[PDB]
Design a protein around this ligand. Structure first.
Ligand code: B12
Ligand code: B12
Ligand code: B12
Ligand code: B12
Ligand SMILES: C[C@H]1O[C@@H](n2cnc3c(N)ncnc32)[C@H](O)[C@@H]1O
Ligand SMILES: C[C@H]1O[C@@H](n2cnc3c(N)ncnc32)[C@H](O)[C@@H]1O
Ligand SMILES: C[C@H]1O[C@@H](n2cnc3c(N)ncnc32)[C@H](O)[C@@H]1O
Ligand SMILES: C[C@H]1O[C@@H](n2cnc3c(N)ncnc32)[C@H](O)[C@@H]1O
Lengths: 195, 197, 198, 197
């Protein structure tokens, strides 16, 4: 059974009940991390590709994307949330794509790290202020597009927390170096990189 | 509200567990509609005013708003999504505040309306195309700011779907008339106008 | 359906063998009460009423079996979705002769929700084997759930004392005096377990 | 090598590592193949290691509890084929439940609505539930032979119009004595419902 085609088709026809049932079949088959890798991310990528090819309009993407963000938020709220100093997770100013940051928070919480997901697009002064006030051990940023990072001045990220991690499709090792962050490729390596 | 102040204080401490416990207590005490009017909505309004007064920063508002959207998403899912020709709910192009749209969808779904929530900020021709293809009986827009409506040409909203409804703090009767939408004074006026049976 | 009617609705769904509808009612409870709350406000009251219905002779053993098997699966689902930090484990089980396992699962779930790596062993673990595993894995604690008093009554004085660096005992079958006799720390509330560990 | 790695991860208390290994087998072999190549060989090896004194009871418990959870999740995934239930349990005194769960799972994958009760059901109660639900069949998994030897002649007859008995603890003459149909393997079990007898 092709859950990815089935789920995208259900979303494009506005069949949210079918879509929710199909996502849950994927959760049961692949497990929590696995459903994100094998179902949620492939469908979001395909939605993007269909839009880029001119095949679907913006409303159709929004319908699918909004639904999948809700499913990941549901999973995130069911993960543990330890006491202790938090890790703040957001996206750079100008970055409205939020699912990468949500995935980072999720992977962290599933390994017993109290990741606070702020939502996207947080001005750096306000992010630093909050990280310092809460005694955050780290700040994690997800960059989906490269332009928001290119807009930032050299060293912009270095003072945000004791550790500052940057990843996503829009990020790369050279950009992380210019901005003063540690570049991280894999979500699984985040908790490890802390412990 | 005493519980409202306590929730916001928990959110500002990063105590997500304590914040959830307070929200769940409000849900048990007031029920879903009650908790929106007496807890979720007053906290969002306060967060906004406190930011405007420089008492909290943007990261703190973000934390609070993100938490409350997740709570409202849970209530949307709890309200059920019936089958049947849908009502599309979104915000005008350039409107990034989405919770008013989510609230409209919630109130509709509570009355058995299949209110499909698209998220915010949908271009008009794309919204109209989706409404046409799905056979949607109505489109509902939430405007929080007035500037996105001011930027639209006369009659821009009139033909998005068989009925087009507009509300929110950034909308008013005169702008709705200019744009060709039916202005809805409040969420119960919206729910009333669209309830089928 | 009102939240106050989900318990009666869930039990009626299970009693007609409608497990898909029972799952939907459970998920509604989860969305309304939250994870800890649905266990407190829906799972535990239904399980208690199943026991009372059985005792009154209103349902039989197979009806209880179907319901507790279902509810154990719903709790397992929540358990699987919670965290699991690396780090020295807490072993969670029930005393020898105790076959009621849901209390132990709930303790494991409360610990994993607070980022404690609770390993759920299943029920009814002989004490030498439990001690051996705790020592080998370097477990920081052993947590026991006693629903009946009889299995505790069958253990000799100080039987629980050396199981792990901390040994916690709770459940409807345990009390402070019995915990003291067996060498365990007594804990009444699940919420206080993670607090106490560290 | 996946079987050996799964057991090793379980014996270290590396639950995340064990889950990842199981998920890998599920993706490689699919549902049916993961049971034959991973779940069943691990359980069998777990018993052999315990008998030989290489692992203790707590280690078997950790492994079986994990595998039972994985299988219940596959059971739920297989869902609810339409029609009158087939009740699946174990005889009174039989605490090994994975064979019953496997029977239920095999049935559901073939479109038969198996309802897995849990283990160790007194026969009068099993008969009452079968009657109340209009069950078309009852299936019992016996791992030990002793619980069967304890039951009266004819004790399984008429629990439902069709009553099947299998597992390592069952054999044809014991099934005959009890008034059940003996089934040697899960393949024959679903086929046995193709046609009446
Ligand atoms: C949904 C969506 C939107 C929604 C986002 C909604 C929301 N609230 O999140 C909206 C409508 C807002 C949107 C807007 C736009 N978007 Co858009 N959108 C998407 C879409 C379809 C899915 C986004 C998503 O969730 N992706 C899932 C992502 C996060 O997964 P991933 O990047 O594979 O990430 C992996 C790793 O990077 C890792 N990871 C991610 N973050 C981090 C962080 C750390 C620390 C680590 C360790 C790992 C990690 O996680 C994943 C593991 O596989 C994508 C398609 C796509 N391919 O992503 C486009 C896409 C990203 N969008 C795109 C574009 C062009 C736009 C717009 C400019 C469109 C326009 N207006 O003209 C705007 C820009 C808005 C802005 N300023 O940011 C392009 C970007 C192309 C490029 N430049 O690279 C894409 C690729 C579509 C396309 N095929 O053209 N978008
Ligand atoms: C959360 C929030 C944000 C978040 C939104 C996050 C998200 N994904 O939704 C973000 C960070 C994106 C944001 C951004 C900005 N925002 Co802002 N933010 C808010 C906040 C704090 C809550 C918004 C909300 O959820 N409102 C919904 C509820 C709480 O509002 P309500 O008035 O009670 O709505 C009632 C009715 O209107 C009705 N309703 C709503 N919709 C509909 C629809 C229909 C059909 C009907 C019948 C009824 C109805 O339901 C409610 C109860 O009945 C508000 C404060 C506020 N008072 O709203 C500001 C506020 C709306 N934001 C404001 C501003 C200035 C901004 C920014 C310009 C800031 C900036 N400089 O970047 C940007 C603009 C972004 C954009 N282009 O839209 C100002 C606007 C003042 C003004 N109009 O001039 C506010 C009022 C804060 C303030 N006090 O200054 N914001
Ligand atoms: C399901 C069930 C069974 C199932 C259990 C299936 C399984 N778990 O795999 C099976 C069929 C095996 C079973 C068997 C029996 N059971 Co029974 N059964 C129940 C039932 C209906 C629900 C059990 C349950 O999960 N309860 C939920 C419990 C665990 O929650 P709780 O005890 O209120 O615990 C709270 C706190 O103590 C805390 N907590 C629990 N553990 C811990 C641990 C720590 C450290 C902490 C801090 C907190 C904590 O969490 C809960 C609230 O937060 C109950 C009804 C009931 N009232 O409990 C009976 C009941 C427990 N069973 C009972 C009986 C008599 C039996 C049998 C003797 C019946 C028989 N003749 O065979 C056998 C004994 C088997 C054995 N243990 O050796 C009686 C016990 C009465 C008494 N004490 O004398 C009960 C009360 C039914 C009744 N009579 O009303 N049973
Ligand atoms: C885990 C386990 C337990 C667990 C059960 C946990 C649970 N299920 O909740 C617990 C701890 C309860 C346990 C306890 C005991 N058990 Co034990 N344990 C096992 C173990 C390791 C796995 C059982 C299992 O799940 N196997 C399922 C699969 C592996 O069985 P299988 O042989 O492949 O079955 C196949 C077929 O029979 C068929 N099938 C099964 N059912 C049905 C039904 C139908 C209709 C059909 C068509 C086919 C079918 O499908 C299967 C796949 O092909 C087995 C070892 C083993 N089975 O080889 C023992 C084993 C069965 N246990 C054994 C023993 C000794 C005990 C105890 C007496 C130990 C004790 N002293 O306390 C108790 C007895 C409890 C009781 N009264 O039932 C012995 C049995 C020896 C004997 N006398 O026959 C075994 C064989 C271990 C050993 N090698 O010594 N056990
Ligand atoms: C990356 C995603 O951005 C969305 N997208 C493209 N243009 C706009 C716009 N004007 N307004 C809102 N979202 C838009 C598309 O739906 C695409 O899939
Ligand atoms: C209305 C809400 O908008 C948020 N806000 C204000 N300025 C910005 C910005 N540059 N980026 C993102 N959010 C912002 C504040 O947190 C306020 O509460
Ligand atoms: C506490 C629970 O024990 C179950 N129970 C009662 N007697 C037996 C038995 N002989 N075998 C199995 N379960 C039993 C009942 O279903 C009751 O609810
Ligand atoms: C068949 C399985 O039974 C378990 N087993 C053996 N003896 C006991 C006991 N006293 N209590 C609980 N489980 C036991 C072992 O772990 C073995 O593998």
């Amino acid at each position: 059974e092709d859950l990815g085609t089935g789920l995208l088709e259900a979303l494009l026809r506005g069949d949210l009940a079918g879509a929710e049932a199909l996502f849950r079949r994927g959760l049961r088959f692949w497990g929590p991390e696995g459903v994100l890798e094998h179902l949620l991310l492939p469908v979001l990528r395909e939605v993007g590709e269909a839009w880029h090819r001119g095949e679907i309009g913006v409303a159709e993407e929004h319908l699918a994307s909004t639904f999948l963000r809700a499913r990941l938020q549901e999973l995130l709220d069911l993960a543990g949330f330890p006491p202790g100093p938090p890790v703040l997770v957001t996206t750079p100013p100008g970055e409205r794509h939020e699912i990468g940051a949500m995935l980072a928070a999720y992977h962290l919480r599933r390994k017993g790290v109290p990741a606070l997901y702020l939502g996207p697009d947080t001005p750096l002064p306000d992010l630093r202020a909050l990280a310092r006030r809460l005694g955050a051990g780290a700040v994690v940023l997800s960059a989906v597009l490269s332009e928001p990072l290119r807009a930032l001045p050299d060293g912009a990220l270095k003072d945000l927390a004791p550790r500052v991690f940057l990843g996503g499709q829009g990020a790369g090792p050279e950009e992380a170096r210019r901005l003063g962050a540690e570049y991280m490729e894999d979500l699984k390596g985040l908790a490890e990189a802390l412990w």
